[PDB]
């Protein structure tokens, strides 16, 4: 109910930051084409019910559109802006060619059946296949979403444009023309973030402390990463509790016996739960879990140095004030977790390009577009006085309002 | 359950004199149900007539008294009836042909829909037919208002329902849940080529009858070179 | 803050009394594309402000959309919707191959200036050219525009496109490819329609006692047609008060007398009020004015045994019950104003054919749908015990119903 | 097997007969285009089948190409070129800006259920959509195929060219903006096709004795169509036999007792066989029933003046030798059964022009064109000593040569 | 004859070997897009003559579709199916973005003419000019067909199109945009692949014994390339004969002596027959001839450890099975002779990039590229036991059916 | 779904069917749901569900081709999980007993957190 004040709240005070008029936060409170549409659809019984669909551009200034797909039943139009306006954060962050955007369609993929949800996505694209093409949108994986789904709208969009469109899709299969890496993004994206960061302030990557609670994908690979690099791990947490090491915890044994769900916890073992594994010491501290559990009982407790919010908001403006205060690094999130759309960016200008990449290339573009934006937000949070959630929103939005601004909508 | 002696007694002299052929020395044979020989179901069922209170009218003298005409469809609302009474399907005769049959089925108008049921079964003939009702009732939520009734596609595995017991039983489900005149129950079984069988079907609920097997015979006839009519004549 | 949902209820009872599936309703309750924009201007003064656009096509199934446009500073979504939903439903009345829509932009042409409006008019086209074109869209005039903003909407579409297309936007000026007659329409459609039910009701068109109350140029047209048909005026009213006389009263001096407002009232004569000029003896009602007039007051007073709603909705549903049980035929006004999109559909078929017509065969051809229409409606309002209101939003959802169901989105 | 091979030694005798040289015979004996498509199908058990699709453009020289679609089991390439060029050879006789075409599926409509089917449609139009637009192809109705078949076309290219297409298929329903008249077509083609052969073979339509076998939507329109023009019905037959009476037959009860499939025979009645029927005295003969009907031993039985043959080859070479010899005038029924196609065109001018004509209309222009090319025919029959078939097939082939020539292709 | 019916088994017995279902046998057994046209030409006397076109897209799910095109006046729909499948299955073994796809002209350019070849290929591009474009379709130089030919393509596709695509075809010449190294491309993939194959055997380079028949460009070019990377050659044969001589042949001086033809055989000096060349002692043998040389009566007497087919088929089964068995690795010609679809490729990719590369940079690229596809395939080929024949089918089919089976089509 | 109305044989039968059709189709994971219950479907015992539907699969020569998973309200204590794991089902899901939790929580007993819990 709130997420879309919030943000335009965040968006002036950016704004107000930067100096600019008040006619930039005028265009870009809201956003600039929102489309609702009604998709038909046959289930199995041969009943049709009507699925109400929806997909917004942001802003289109800097180029091509783009944004993410969730299948969500409780989506609605504030919400969808709300992510759009977030997704163009993002984009601004990460310097990238996009404006930003977001779609979404009012469903339940748990009801909702194989066949089903392959002709959901189909009527989809039939549905707002007039505002969506190579140069105007990019579909891109999300929620409730994933390759199969991304490979049938390829395919539809293939269809309907007569000829072939890889570009048009991200997210799409190996085969189809996909890129390597796209699971363990995130995790490089928080791997370089976390190295940069100790190197800034210091801390010795070798034989830091570091403890990952929240144990999926994003989870065991930045585990394998730093063990990797030589930093070691005190400390891993999941849904069935976690663990506790001074000297290491063999990484290469827990991912070696990681199931499905990377659960790791034993069975006849007592563990610690969460609120108590973040007062265990550490050098970097990175919570990868639920939401909202740094506040201000913790925030007197919590010891690491540094920060990373790998997760979308963990932590509430009051703990982010005592961090503060306790002069400790917190790393945005909208820069912890831009390895997503990063990965995202190289696949389509893979597809462009028409020819594919290999995993050490994709390594090193990565690397280098994720250290060039750290120490460029850095070096503008150390200039101005303020919090780094605050040089991330303002960076992310200067370019935005700067591109506006030269193509004269203003 | 066809036989030489009722082909050659039954289907060639039909058409020799136009007419069901006659006879003398009415049945003796005992009843079906002491028979032991396998019987059709139809010989258990044993036709009617009117003694008193009411006499036996005539059809060929009395001919504009009859009527055969029948509606194929849904009938619309009773009590306010406006066009959608009489948008339907009207036929002349019970008995159908090939080329209509397959036009019926053909049809594709939204409103006259057609659906097709197979009626056989494995082991079970409760759970036969409450299959076949759990496929009457979803077409009839789908929309349609015609069904087949086809045993066609029947091999070792799968064997025919009785079709005049399936006809009932359809029958009977439809009108005790008051869906019997939103549909239209069209029967082709192979079993279907005495006046005696098609009597049944009409009067137990059938809409109109595809004898396919018979007419497949008088086509293998006419290949062969007995009744040297014309196909479409005969 | 009532329009939508008395338009959605209206819908309703038309669809249950069709007896289609709740499907129909579903789709048809929403329009299935609404655009919001914001377009750029420069004014005068060198300071930029940002008008708030829209667009809603509420179906596309028949084939192009059409709808006008209302510079309207009030004008909302909800507004937007409904007008769209009655537009269509004048489509459908019609039998056009129209589907129905409407624009607007969130402005006030009383302080804009001239240079000022024709940038507001470029850029709504720049921002909604993408999703408007021959078979897709087609603005037309409407509260707060007219030729010139025709004309240089279509100008501009000219340049965006880079070929001629006169048939693109419908309402230009006449040497720009425009219709004769496109200032009469209105009235000839009333005048067809007071024939046919006059006709109809036995009641002989020769010597019959008109009252027109509401002289702007429908009244004054709709009097020409009527005197020179033959019927007799013995009422008429403005802005300033009326007249009576029931033995005629020079339709040929009060129309050669008539200023370019249509005031008619002479200046040192006393003058009846609207209030007592409806009371007036007479064989056909003609309100062409401000709305909400008939109540329950005067419905006791009514005496005409025509009424013909010219204007939108002047009546209430109280006062349409009393003439119901009065036995007083009353003319929707869905039919009685149609006039101004024939005529438009005429012009578009003109341009498109790029051979035009006459005043003649525009006269004949739109008589003759005119006819066709109030006889249908009539037929099926007799076939089926209601209200001729209730005829004409069954009518003309039957058709967009239909093919929607032909066309299998349900 | 030797439908191929009869089109080609048909169209080179009528290319020797005009005297053109030999490119052209080289250039018209094969279609320009043939496709074969594969399209993917999804059954009510899940399992999936792929049908074999097709479609052929014999010529585009004089503009867009038209064809059917029949949905029979064993369609061939053979037989769709054949078709195509038949269709060809119609469109030069009624003298359309029409080239020529067909398409065709392999499939069993008997076995397919409904939703299938609609899939089944939608996967052939997605498949072959490439090739296939307003100025380059025409879909129609034909063999297994009807109005939901073709609104569900129409409703597919809406959606994959984004822009509403009306025109882009003929045979649509009425509200889809279909064209009145499209079920009496043939019967109107073929009543004044008779009117004018009688006029010109001097036979007075007046008291004409007429008999009409086969007794389908075409021959009841057709004996409809005779008895308000004043000819006499002295036969009539159907599917169970026939009747005779020399001095009418009461044509409104039949058609009044007409059934749905138009079955009149009595129960208790004897009825006449096709073959006694052919000699029963009349003055017109009407064969529109089984095909290799008229035959060596009937020709010398056959007594009607003027025979029409509205169905499909009803004749052979043989029996057309005799009636020549005989001199009974033998309409072909090439130009016989044309009215489909001319009303099918008519329906696409209506389409393309946006404004709907009505049955007076309709009716007039149709039977300007019919009688048009059946004076020219038999003018060109009568100046050159040939016979009618031959006539027919050189008028046909004279418009498509001479339009290659002019284009230069050859 | 046996052409289409063998590509059919042997991509059977691979979909077999996959274990996927038979739908994609039964939608990759046939090309989905056939295409048949007629082009007219004049000649030089001014006459006429009609040559009949073909044009195949074997299947375009992974992408835009790609093959040659040649002028052999046998050239029929089967060998162009055969053909299209066989490059279909190129491409898939070389993980290409192509689909595969062949064309054909039926002529002779023995007796036709310069500007009548100029004529018959402007006209082939304007009949097929509508299902052919950048990403539809992609020409490219095959028998009877080279740079001028490709020249003449892009100059009319540019013309038709009306804005300049130089990457529509490849195999340009230089100026025009054309890639280096396109003449070399064969043997330096058949010199990547021999490398890996000794590395893989243990075979060392250096001065291994090579053989190599059939000295045209691609002999010549392996010949250089061998003696630069430093194994010896041991034998050379021409359409003259050959040599001999176990301590080197001196290729410098051979390649500074080699003709337009590359005959290098002396006048005076007794040669060596190719059928006795086979026999010589030698670690790698390099058929580059006349195909069907290695039968059963030399499979006895072939003694190289490496045999590389950089020829088309030139052994046969009963061969490949006695080299089998006694153990001598046969290399596929699929694999070997793919550099010439890799240049290609690369040209394409340089011509959509719009900025040329080096030599250096081509040579790295490709020699990636081949090493990756050999290492695969030998892999692959070890994992299972089987001819390393039905491991590049199998892996060739393997994306080909699995980007089939993501896009949904099955 | 995992449900009958007056026919046991019926109702086993039909879901035989539909396993039987997934199984063509391709699936590799059934889901018996309990969920969707009214007062005119009641629930087969899931023990007696899941032993037929093993039973039945076994017999076909199909098990090893699908993932029998259970979701079934009646599943709180070790021995009926123990016996659903012994007569074929690949997992249980008590979301009764988690919504109980639920209810009980927003309560205010068990104080301990949901997703801890």
Redesign the interface.
């Known amino acids: 109910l709130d997420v879309l004040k919030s943000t335009q709240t965040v968006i002036h005070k950016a704004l107000e930051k930067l100096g600019y008029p008040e006619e930039v936060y005028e265009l870009l409170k809201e956003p600039m084409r929102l489309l609702t549409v009604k998709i038909p659809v046959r289930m199995d019984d041969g009943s049709v019910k009507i699925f109400t669909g929806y997909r917004a551009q942001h802003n289109d200034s800097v180029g091509p559109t783009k944004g993410g797909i969730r299948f969500h039943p409780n989506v609605t139009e504030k919400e969808v802006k709300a992510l759009s306006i977030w997704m163009s954060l993002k984009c601004g962050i990460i310097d990238l060619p996009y404006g930003g955007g977001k779609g979404g369609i009012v469903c339940d993929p748990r009801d909702m059946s194989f066949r089903e949800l392959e002709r959901l996505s189909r009527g989809y694209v039939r549905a707002i296949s007039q505002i969506v093409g190579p140069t105007k949108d990019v579909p891109a994986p999300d929620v409730f979403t994933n390759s199969q789904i991304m490979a049938w709208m390829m395919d539809e969009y293939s269809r309907i444009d007569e000829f072939n469109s890889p570009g048009f899709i991200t997210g799409k299969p190996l085969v189809l023309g996909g890129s390597h890496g796209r699971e363990s993004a995130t995790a490089k994206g928080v791997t370089i973030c976390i190295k940069e960061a100790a190197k800034k302030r210091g801390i010795d990557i070798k034989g830091a402390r570091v403890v990952v609670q929240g144990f999926g994908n994003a989870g065991s690979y930045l585990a394998k990463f730093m063990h990797d690099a030589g930093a070691k791990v005190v400390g891993i947490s999941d849904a069935y509790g976690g663990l506790y090491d001074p000297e290491g915890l063999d990484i290469d044994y827990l991912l070696d016996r990681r199931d499905s769900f990377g659960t790791v916890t034993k069975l006849f073992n007592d563990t610690i739960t969460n609120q108590e594994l973040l007062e265990l010491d550490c050098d970097i501290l990175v919570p990868a879990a639920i939401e909202n559990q740094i506040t201000e009982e913790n925030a007197h407790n919590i010891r690491a140095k540094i920060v990373v919010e790998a997760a979308n908001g963990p932590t509430t403006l009051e703990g982010t004030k005592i961090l503060s205060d306790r002069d400790i690094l917190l790393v945005p999130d909208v820069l912890a977790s831009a390895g997503g759309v990063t990965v995202s960016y190289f696949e389509w200008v893979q597809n462009n390009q028409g020819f594919y990449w290999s995993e050490e290339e994709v390594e090193e573009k990565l690397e280098k577009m994720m250290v060039k934006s750290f120490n460029n937000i850095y070096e503008m949070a150390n200039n101005r006085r303020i919090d780094m959630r605050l040089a991330a929103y303002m960076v992310g939005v200067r370019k935005m309002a700067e591109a506006s601004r030269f193509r004269g909508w203003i | 359950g066809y036989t030489y002696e009722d082909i050659q007694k039954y289907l060639i002299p039909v058409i020799k004199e136009?007419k069901d052929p006659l006879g003398s020395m009415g049945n003796d044979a005992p009843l079906a149900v002491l028979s032991d020989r396998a019987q059709s179901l139809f010989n258990y069922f044993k036709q009617l007539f009117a003694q008193v209170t009411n006499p036996p009218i005539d059809?060929?003298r009395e001919?504009l008294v009859?009527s055969?005409?029948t509606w194929l469809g849904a009938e619309g609302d009773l009590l306010h009836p406006?066009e959608r009474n009489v948008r339907r399907?009207?036929?002349?005769?019970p008995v159908l042909?090939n080329?209509?049959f397959?036009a019926l089925?053909?049809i594709?108008?939204?409103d006259l829909?057609?659906?097709?049921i197979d009626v056989l079964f494995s082991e079970?003939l409760?759970?036969g037919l409450?299959?076949m009702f759990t496929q009457a009732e979803?077409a009839i939520?789908?929309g349609v208002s015609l069904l087949i009734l086809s045993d066609k596609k029947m091999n070792e595995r799968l064997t025919p329902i009785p079709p005049l017991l399936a006809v009932s039983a359809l029958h009977q489900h439809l009108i005790r849940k008051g869906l019997r005149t939103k549909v239209s129950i069209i029967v082709e079984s192979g079993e279907a080529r005495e006046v005696h069988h098609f009597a049944a079907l009409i009067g137990y609920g059938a809409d109109a009858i595809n004898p396919y097997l018979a007419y497949a015979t008088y086509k293998q006839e006419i290949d062969e070179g007995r009744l040297d009519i014309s196909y479409?004549?005969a």
Chains 1, 3, 4, 5 share one sequence.
């Open positions: 136009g059809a060929i001919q009859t055969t005409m406006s399907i009207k036929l002349y005769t042909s080329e209509q397959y089925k053909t594709v108008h939204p829909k057609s659906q097709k079970d409760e759970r409450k299959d979803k939520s789908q479409e004549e």
